[PDB]
Design a protein around this ligand. Structure first.
Ligand SMILES: Nc1nc2c(ncn2[C@@H]2O[C@H](COP(=O)(O)OP(=O)(O)O)[C@@H](O)[C@H]2O)c(=O)[nH]1
Ligand SMILES: [Mn+2]
Ligand SMILES: [Mn+2]
Ligand SMILES: [Mn+2]
Ligand code: NA
Length: 611
């Protein structure tokens, strides 16, 4: 009877699969030994029954206050991305990360093919025993689009299948769009075959000790073991659309970036599109769907996390959002801070590690909504919670997984397969001191240097504690698919291609100490950027780049804001900054640092010495 798993197919048919899709499914069905195989069709009925099954299994809880919303609570050991267990396999180490002068590289983690094979054999054989292998055909980008890249995710987590339905275009239509074309091979398992050898915490299957998120770009495979958290288990998102995609992008002449895409319209009706790279949990989602406080202005959301970008024939940098939803940080989200998000997350939305009110609603730190007297709160740890306990009701990296199409200000061209023309790129992070509210790069090369110099306080999105200022060039430290030096060269090369309308490059700091209220008020910084792209004489030259002139920023309704402190450029801070950037780039980028980046470093060092 061959290696035929037709007898265990519980939805769909192996005969209906493309030739190479069948081999991929059956080959891993042989390795992983699932009891059932569920080929996903992506239908509403499948989604409802999947949620009902998880509810019956005690995996998720229904939120009775809302329209088809659900709550998952995880094992506390499996709450975020884990960079130290995140690896890229290549033949040569140099292709994946530059060879550092000292210790280990901070720009990724390389693992040899031999090392990974042994790790792979220690984990995956029989790992799905007693479980259903779900087969997820998903499209990153819109269905039909020649830009879109299709993947097949195999997983034993129904939480992953439900989340992938939101975060990607998922179903039978993807298999029909694929045919005998190429697809990314995504393999995932929580790593707890039945019968369970280890006790199960919060009904959340996971394997912390053996957690491993591997990328094999040469083989076009993503292999992920042990973790159910979205960043580690939704393999279309970070693993494919940043790590695997950024390498493909380098090879084919496009860009895959950790960037929101937004459209901003002035009072007249003139529209511009901006992209912005901030590190995980440093303000992308809130900016991408902001409610602008300036009257007449209008922000619209194309995407909040991943941008795929390429020059068209006319020289416009065209961006698309390859995702289908927002996997956004929960705490802080309110009608004050992010009202467009709240209109999105009230239906067809899955929440993870947030608190639950007794009347079937969600709760977290900074929700800015006092409860009725008598309404009690169950925490993310499934305990009865009160502020007398010093612990927060929701985990810091708790999430909502919501459809993008439900955003009130979703851009009418967000599914356009030609993309939206980018006229501005914004870099930034959490710098509590020294860095101005906004500056503008002097050229493309300086702009690329500014991206490379980026630093930001650590967040709960990965394993890093203490709120320490880490290096995060382009907000891509955890996501480089290949050598960062080559990545810099790829970016710099975009200046050389004829007729290229290069976006203006800016750097922002919302988080200086906060000296700036942020959220909707950042529309004032976006106004200045809008004008500078138009070419208004609203900029003053400083050593670090152009800053807004006196009376350039609309601060009407904000006379209290200290402009001197917020835009202060200290020689003492900045001569220290360039020294720290020098040592980092030499240590970590080393022989693969392009000359032009070193020239901008020497030029910035020079300008600071003249202060
Ligand atoms: N102070 C301040 N906080 C912000 C701002 N934008 C977002 N945040 C907060 O920082 C966290 C991350 O924001 P988010 O937009 O979700 O970051 P993302 O993960 O990069 O999309 C949330 O808890 C927000 O409340 C801002 O402009 N100022
Ligand atoms: Mn992100
Ligand atoms: Mn986000
Ligand atoms: Mn050049
Ligand atoms: Na659970």
């Amino acid at each position: 009877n061959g290696l035929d798993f037709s007898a265990k197919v519980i939805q769909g048919s192996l005969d209906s699969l493309p030739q190479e899709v069948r081999k991929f499914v059956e080959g891993n069905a042989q390795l992983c030994q699932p009891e059932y195989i569920h080929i996903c069709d992506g239908s509403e009925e499948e989604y409802g029954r999947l949620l009902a099954h998880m509810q019956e299994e005690g995996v998720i809880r229904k939120l009775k206050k809302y329209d088809n919303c659900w709550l998952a609570l995880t094992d506390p050991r499996d709450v975020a991305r884990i960079e130290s267990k995140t690896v890229i396999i290549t033949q040569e180490q140099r292709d994946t990360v530059p060879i550092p002068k000292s210790g280990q590289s901070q720009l990724g983690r390389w693992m040899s093919e031999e090392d990974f094979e042994k790790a792979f054999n220690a984990r995956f054989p029989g790992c799905m025993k007693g479980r259903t292998m779900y087969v997820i055909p998903f499209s990153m980008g819109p269905l039909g689009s020649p830009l879109a890249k299709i993947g097949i995710e195999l997983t034993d987590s129904p939480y992953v299948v439900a989340s992938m339905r939101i975060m990607t275009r998922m179903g039978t239509s993807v298999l029909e769009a694929l045919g005998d074309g190429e697809f990314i091979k995504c393999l995932h398992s929580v790593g707890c075959p039945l019968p369970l050898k280890k006790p199960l915490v919060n009904n959340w299957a996971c394997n912390p000790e053996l957690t491993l998120i591997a990328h094999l770009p040469d083989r076009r495979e993503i292999i992920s073991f042990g973790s159910g958290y979205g960043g580690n288990s939704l393999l279309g998102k970070k693993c494919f659309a940043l790590r695997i995609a950024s390498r493909l992008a380098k090879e084919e002449g496009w860009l895959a970036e950790h960037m929101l895409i937004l459209g901003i319209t002035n009072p007249e009706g003139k529209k511009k599109y901006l992209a912005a790279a901030f590190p995980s949990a440093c303000g992308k989602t809130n900016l991408a769907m902001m409610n602008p406080t300036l009257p007449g202005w209008k922000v619209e959301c194309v995407g909040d996390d991943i941008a795929w970008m390429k020059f068209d024939a006319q020289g416009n940098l065209r961006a698309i959002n390859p995702e289908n939803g927002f996997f956004g940080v929960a705490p802080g989200t309110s009608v004050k801070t992010n009202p467009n998000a709240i209109k999105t997350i009230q239906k067809n939305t899955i929440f993870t590690n947030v608190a639950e009110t007794s009347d079937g609603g969600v709760y977290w730190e900074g929700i800015d909504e006092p409860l009725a007297p008598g309404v009690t709160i169950t925490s993310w740890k499934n305990k009865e919670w009160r502020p007398q306990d010093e612990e927060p009701c929701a985990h810091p990296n708790s999430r909502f997984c919501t459809p993008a199409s439900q955003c009130p200000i979703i851009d009418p061209a967000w599914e356009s397969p030609e993309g939206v023309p980018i006229e501005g790129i914004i870099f930034g992070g959490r710098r509590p001191a020294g860095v101005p509210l906004v500056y503008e790069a002097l050229s493309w090369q300086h702009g690329v240097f500014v991206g490379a110099a980026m630093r930001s306080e650590a967040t709960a999105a990965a394993e890093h504690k203490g709120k320490v200022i880490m290096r995060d060039p382009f907000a891509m430290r955890p996501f480089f698919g290949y050598n960062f030096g080559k990545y810099l060269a790829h970016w710099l090369s975009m200046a050389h291609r004829p007729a290229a309308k290069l976006p203006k490059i800016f750097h922002v700091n919302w988080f200086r100490k906060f000296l700036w209220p942020g959220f909707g008020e950042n529309s004032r910084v976006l106004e200045w950027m809008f004008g500078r792209i138009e070419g208004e004489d609203s900029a003053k030259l400083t050593p670090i780049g152009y800053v807004p002139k006196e009376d350039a920023l609309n601060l009407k309704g904000l006379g209290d804001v200290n402009v001197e402190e917020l835009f202060g450029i200290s020689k003492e801070f900045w001569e220290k900054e360039v020294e720290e950037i020098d040592k980092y780039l030499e240590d970590q980028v080393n022989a693969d640092l392009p000359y032009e980046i070193e020239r901008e470093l020497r030029a910035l060092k020079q300008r600071i010495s003249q202060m």
